[PDB]
Design a protein around this ligand. Structure first.
Ligand SMILES: [K+]
Ligand SMILES: [K+]
Ligand SMILES: [K+]
Ligand SMILES: [K+]
Ligand SMILES: [K+]
Ligand SMILES: [K+]
Ligand SMILES: [K+]
Ligand SMILES: [K+]
Ligand SMILES: [K+]
Ligand SMILES: [K+]
Ligand SMILES: [K+]
Ligand SMILES: [K+]
Ligand SMILES: [K+]
Ligand SMILES: [K+]
Ligand SMILES: [K+]
Ligand SMILES: [K+]
Ligand SMILES: [K+]
Ligand SMILES: [K+]
Ligand SMILES: [K+]
Ligand SMILES: [K+]
Ligand SMILES: [K+]
Ligand SMILES: [K+]
Ligand SMILES: [K+]
Ligand SMILES: [K+]
Ligand SMILES: [K+]
Ligand SMILES: [K+]
Ligand SMILES: [K+]
Ligand SMILES: [K+]
Lengths: 214, 214
């Protein structure tokens, strides 16, 4: 019971899906996993009650952190709240409500082994690198390209070192494992499921209801 | 009236969308464009009547070609049917029923100017190159990666030269502009719309009905 989750929830994350705010879906998935010791929800204080409500229903410590200006500052804020002895930090965008227990288990395993891991899926589209003149530079090898999801799972000492680089050099990162890439430490891509979609538009909500109804 | 369309339609392309087989949607879009002189539909002969039916409703020459084993052989088969003097070949996957007239006009313009062009959209996901050990090699620069759609628009002399390379060297290509890339001739990526989705699953059909109902 060694994993700390940072659940990034700081309104599109509170849009109802089957009547319940999207952020609660992944919250419950992590709360039922035996490896998870605590969930640090990063949200505006106004929304804390959405989660506290369920606190006596769940077998994790529930803690909060205040969001920052950019996703990386929200991650940093959650990281100050995790247990001093957690073995792994599992960072998740609450706009991904449909992550599967099996896929979380897999990226936790791979993060334990490598130190950093992220859920990904092979890209289904043909992807080309395009220069600033709108010309194709190259076609990227289909067998080689992965679309990233969350969770991103990183050992805390590694993440803390990475934030020391980020804060001391003004890095801008849009994900968590980019910090570890900077460090030249390996990042493992764990194969997930294409159903772990991000839900931000009402088109995405309709797809999420379809997936849930399958 | 200078453009020849090769419409690749050779059953998931005949699944109904609002009651009409998917392949007819883009067929009609191209038939109404003044630049299009002819549409060569590549389909099994059994399906020809789906399109012929509308022949006196449309201001293009309607022709057919027989599909081959792989997409590139189907393209080659359509290419043998185009007008000896067309200025541009516009190749489209009939599983993309929602392409917009405005986006077709744009990629035709860019194909006229460059010799090869393809509709694309910036990739919305974070994409990483991953080696065979499942490790991230690099994170690809978000500002630089495009997802390809169809049409792909190529001048016929260029395409014919490219097929001479393909047939004389056993190339396997999953798109049309890869042939021109091989030739070291420029390929322009014209910015399209994220609504030009490929419809193969019933999830995609539901999204396509939503888009059409917007
Ligand atoms: K979940
Ligand atoms: K637990
Ligand atoms: K504790
Ligand atoms: K607290
Ligand atoms: K904090
Ligand atoms: K603290
Ligand atoms: K999801
Ligand atoms: K969620
Ligand atoms: K999943
Ligand atoms: K596990
Ligand atoms: K291992
Ligand atoms: K910043
Ligand atoms: K997944
Ligand atoms: K929409
Ligand atoms: K269309
Ligand atoms: K026409
Ligand atoms: K003619
Ligand atoms: K004919
Ligand atoms: K032919
Ligand atoms: K012919
Ligand atoms: K489409
Ligand atoms: K179509
Ligand atoms: K379009
Ligand atoms: K045009
Ligand atoms: K020009
Ligand atoms: K082949
Ligand atoms: K488009
Ligand atoms: K499905």
């Amino acid at each position: 019971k060694s994993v700390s989750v940072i659940l990034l929830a700081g309104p599109k994350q509170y849009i109802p899906l089957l009547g319940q705010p999207i952020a609660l879906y992944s919250f419950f998935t992590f709360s039922r996993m035996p490896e998870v010791k605590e969930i640090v929800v990063v949200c505006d204080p106004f929304f804390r009650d959405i989660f506290e409500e369920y606190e006596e229903s769940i077998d994790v410590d529930l803690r909060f952190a205040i969001p920052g200006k950019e996703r990386q500052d929200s991650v940093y804020s959650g990281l100050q709240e995790i247990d001093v002895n957690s073995e792994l930090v599992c960072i998740h965008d609450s706009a991904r409500p449909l992550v599967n227990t099996e896929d979380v288990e897999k990226v936790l395993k791979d993060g334990s082994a490598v130190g950093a891991a992220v859920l990904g899926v092979p890209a289904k589209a043909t992807i080309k690198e395009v220069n600033s003149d709108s010309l194709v530079v190259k076609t990227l090898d289909r067998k080689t390209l992965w679309e990233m999801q969350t969770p991103q799972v990183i050992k805390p000492e590694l993440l803390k070192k990475g934030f020391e680089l980020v804060k001391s050099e003004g890095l801008e990162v849009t994900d968590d494992v980019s910090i570890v890439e900077y460090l030249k430490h390996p990042v493992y891509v764990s194969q997930g499921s294409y159903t772990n979609i991000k839900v931000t538009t009402p088109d995405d909500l309709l797809l999420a209801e379809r997936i849930l109804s399958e």
